[PDB]
Amino acid sequence: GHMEHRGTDIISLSQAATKIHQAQQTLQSTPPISEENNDERTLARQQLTSSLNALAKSGVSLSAEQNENLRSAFIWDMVSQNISAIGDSYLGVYENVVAVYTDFYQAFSDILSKMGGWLLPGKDGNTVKLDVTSLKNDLNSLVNKYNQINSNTVLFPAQSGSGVKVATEAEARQWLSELNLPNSCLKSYGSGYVVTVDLTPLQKMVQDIDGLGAPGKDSKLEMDNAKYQAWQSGFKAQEENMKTTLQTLTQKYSNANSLYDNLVKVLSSTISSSLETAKSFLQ
């Protein structure tokens, strides 16, 4: 127990520092906006935990101060276990939530991009014509698409290659609460439950469109500028509800990512302190 081996300690600790820094760089720079991106982020965490498993076997020893910093923040196999669970069951869920919501929101944006063409000149300068039918049909089609249960719609659990992965009612309700989503997002499927995208603003938009009254023979609705403007304000309010939902989720994702990163910093600080120790010697 008297044979020192600074050289090999320095090599092992530097190897771990490097792998952790690379994973951290990926998790800080790669947005969770596509399946490809989240595959890269998941692989980065796999790389980080493999590095800790390797470090655990290396023979590097920790001080009493370091052992304690680690126990409290989260021995090396306990650390790897705890960080693995958070990456998989907390951050990985949030990544899925953002990627699914991103593509849903894009589908909505694509509809909004058509609205210019659905607003026509009226009979005079005090009236407009809104193509209420084309707008309602496109919104309804979106609702129908995202009311299904599949990999395009399910926020939790994150889905794999086959079937529909479901959770117990209690597990799904916990995430519903965690995400601050309305009750309508909680759905039974087969043997359990999933949490899906919020369709309420879309459904309200359609209601408010029918609220305007029946279209004319052309399938469109003539309206005075005041009525149109009042309708548009209400429509924009529903767009703001969807924007707000997405904002809450992306912020919550960022904070989940920051919580993991804070644990990564603890790892990096621990390893840097060991490296100092391996390089240091009392006069």
Candidates 242, 151, 159, 169; CA nearest to 200 is 242
Omega prior to 121 cis, within 30 of 0: no
* Choices 2-10, 44-52, 101-109, 243-251; region in contact with Ni ion by CB under 5 A: 2-10
- Closest CB 61 distance from Ni ion, rounded Å: 13
Alpha-carbon span 30 to 233, nearest angstrom = 36
- Closest CB 59 distance from Ni ion, rounded Å: 13
Q: Which two tokens stand for residue 129?
A: 């014509």
Using only C-alpha atoms, the chain has a radius of gyration, in whole angstroms, of 26
Burial 37-59 (b: 16+ CB within 10 A, else e): bbeebbebbeebbebbeebbeee
Instruction: Note whether 2 binds Ni ion by CB under 5 A.
Output: yes
Using CB under 5 A as the binding criterion, the count of chain residues that bind Ni ion stands at: 3
Nearer to Ni ion, 3 or 282 (CB): 3
Nearer to Ni ion, 3 or 64 (CB): 3
- Closest CB 76 distance from Ni ion, rounded Å: 22
Candidates 19, 73, 78; CA nearest to 45 is 19
Nearer to Ni ion, 5 or 265 (CB): 5
In the stretch 3-42, what mask flags binding to Ni ion with x, by CB under 5 A? x---------------------------------------
- Closest CB 4 distance from Ni ion, rounded Å: 9
In the stretch 154-183, what mask flags binding to Ni ion with x, by CB under 5 A? ------------------------------
Cβ-contact 99, 37 below 8 angstroms: yes
Alpha-carbon span 225 to 215, nearest angstrom = 16
Residue 79's H or E segment, with its range, is helix 76-86
Alpha-carbon span 236 to 119, nearest angstrom = 15
Instruction: Note whether 125 binds Ni ion by CB under 5 A.
Output: no
Q: Which residue has the tokens 């809450």?
A: 248
Nearer to Ni ion, 2 or 217 (CB): 2
- Closest CB 273 distance from Ni ion, rounded Å: 23
Question: Binding Ni ion by CB under 5 A: which of 1, 7, 116, 121?
Answer: 1
Nearer to Ni ion, 4 or 124 (CB): 4
- Closest CB 60 distance from Ni ion, rounded Å: 16
**Site for Ni ion, rule CB under 5 A:** 1-3
